[PDB]
Amino acid sequence: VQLTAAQELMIQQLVAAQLQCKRSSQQRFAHFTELAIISVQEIVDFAKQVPGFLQLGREDQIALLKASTIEIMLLETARRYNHETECITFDFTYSKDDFHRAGLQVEFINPIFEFSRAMRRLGLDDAEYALLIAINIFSADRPNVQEPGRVEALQQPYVEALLSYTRIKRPQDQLRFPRMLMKLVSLRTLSSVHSEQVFALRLQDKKLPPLLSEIWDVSHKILHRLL
Amino acid sequence: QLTAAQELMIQQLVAAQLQVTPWPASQQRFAHFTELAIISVQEIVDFAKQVPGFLQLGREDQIALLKASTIEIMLLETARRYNHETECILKDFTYSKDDFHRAGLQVEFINPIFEFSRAMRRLGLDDAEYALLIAINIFSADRPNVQEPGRVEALQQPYVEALLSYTRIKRPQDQLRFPRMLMKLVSLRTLSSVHSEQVFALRLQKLPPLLSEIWDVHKILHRLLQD
Ligand SMILES: CC(C)(C)OC(=O)N1CC[C@@]2(C(=O)Nc3ccccc32)[C@@H]1c1ccccc1
Ligand SMILES: CC(C)(C)OC(=O)N1CC[C@@]2(C(=O)Nc3ccccc32)[C@@H]1c1ccccc1
Secondary structure (H helix, E strand, O other): OOOOHHHHHHHHHHHHHHHOOOOOOHHHHHHHHHHHHHHHHHHHHHHHHOOOOOOOOHHHHHHHHHHHHHHHHHHHHHHOEEOOOOEEEOOOEEOHHHHHHOOOOHHHHHHHHHHHHHHHHHOOOHHHHHHHHHHHHOOOOOOOOOOHHHHHHHHHHHHHHHHHHHHHHOOOOOOHHHHHHHHHHHHHHHHHHHHHHHHHHHHOOOOOOHHHHHHHOOOOHHHHHHO | OOOHHHHHHHHHHHHHHHOOOOOOOHHHHHHHHHHHHHHHHHHHHHHHHHOOOOOOOOHHHHHHHHHHHHHHHHHHHHHHOOEOOOOEOOOOOOOOHHHHHHOOOOHHHHHHHHHHHHHHHHHOOOHHHHHHHHHHHHOOOOOOOOOOHHHHHHHHHHHHHHHHHHHHHHOOOOOOHHHHHHHHHHHHHHHHHHHHHHHHHHHHOOOOHHHHHHHOOOHHHHHHHOO
């Protein structure tokens, strides 16, 4: 019938916390990694602000962040993708050739753009994006998760809220919410391709910095301090 | 409520769906399981022919969908016949966790399949829900090397629509069942990712020609489609 006042507060808390998330070939690669570093730090600070993340064991908190960080970034990329200019903004704006010039393969870049256009067609507002990020963080099937049951339980409220929210925004379009959730399936494959991209960069004498190598290369000391 | 036109479709899908070497020694046990995998792959291609619209797509795409889907369909089938009373997972070739471990499968791969199966069991899926979930899995637009993603997404929508409508009728009060079912598709991508690592580990300690076509890093797969 309608959103429950308890959810309205929770949604509104999530979007507000999110809006505070703001700074304005090897050299090109080394540039992008510093952008990745800043965004990772913003995500961990955001993850602290989500209800219940703090409650979990650090080992699980790490396990969720390692896997989630690439997918949250790809969601953020999709949110600020401009279909009028074909540029992705981090107001650090970049085109497809800028990503190619830094050593990223075309098999990885083109799908991110295709993913972004598909996300654009769904017409997601900030509340939908915020809830999608919460659902993404609390994924029970991430590797090396000690307490999958607790993680699944923390996810349910955000899936419930997202269901209720999508029903109010577009009552007639029932298939929007299923299609949104099916983008989570696409983020897993794009995360899988990203690991191949990392390895392909190593071949081109392009190795990751210390924070990013903790999460993406294959004792997360850097990641503990921020938590 | 459901449209009777869908109903025939569901009923056709469920009906279509309902239709070896000695087990001892590790290599013999492994060689046993591969022959079970061979038979099940052949059953899936015959099933894929019976799904409406699969035949209409180009062979190159038909291959691309089957390569990726086969592991996920098998894991769905494993979950369907997982027994929580006995912890055991062909017609009645029953196996326990130690049987899988004895054949050289690592525990990092076995335990998640069981955890996945228990999670699937908690959802309480009937044969219609399983059947529709399999159809949705086959028609995934973001599989690698797909020439016609638009047509694949279009063939998927009716099954997602049917699954939505079906789940609403079966349990009107439990709204979160359908979202949780679709989120299992996300879990199948990671389990497919782990399965590729499992295959490589084993080579380290080699698959039969048919599987190696689908899983190792296409003549058999064409003949089954050409019939
Ligand atoms: C190269 C490093 C390791 C820093 O970055 C990545 O490997 N990636 C992976 C995801 C990423 C993103 O967020 N947008 C986007 C668009 C196209 C390709 C790659 C990406 C990000 C990324 C790429 C470029 C700039 C910032 C982040
Ligand atoms: C490596 C080989 C080819 C043997 O098999 C697989 O790689 N797999 C991967 C998926 C599989 C299955 O279908 N059920 C199940 C349950 C536990 C573990 C593994 C599986 C299957 C599989 C395993 C055992 C028997 C038949 C199929």
